[PDB]
Amino acid sequence: KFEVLLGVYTNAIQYVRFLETALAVSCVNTEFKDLSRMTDGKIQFRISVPTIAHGDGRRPSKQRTFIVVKNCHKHHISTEMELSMLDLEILHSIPETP
Amino acid sequence: EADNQIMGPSSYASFVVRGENLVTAVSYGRVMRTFEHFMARIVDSP
């Protein structure tokens, strides 16, 4: 028997993603797909400065290619997902009746 | 405001490979055309 009519209000949440938000402009991001593969915490930088061709002094110099190294940070974000046992036992057995 | 939204990529970039295109020496025309492509791209912006 339809006894009473109750109204509840769930909360709409603006779910965000890293590409959807705006600070992904700053970071050219990749999908490296397994971070155990890189085995050195430093990364070599090949900085190549160009040259300006002076003529009066006749004092030529090549492009003074100098190479420095910089570290690679790593982070570890973790959370929990709370799935119920009965819903997984429902999901394991495919039903056929409506 | 100059706008209200910006066009950005829908997915992360993937790592592409470059260098081990191990096709054989096709002809003299292929190596000459690629040499002209690599050297005449110095003075050409488009």
Partner: peptide, 23 residues
């Protein structure tokens, strides 16, 4: 360093199909 004795075969570009720089 770490590249003091190894040969490099190819590279892995960050989607730079026409650019050669980047990472």
């Amino acid at each position: 360093s770490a590249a003091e004795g190894l040969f490099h075969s190819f590279d892995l570009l960050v989607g730079k199909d026409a650019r050669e720089a980047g990472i």
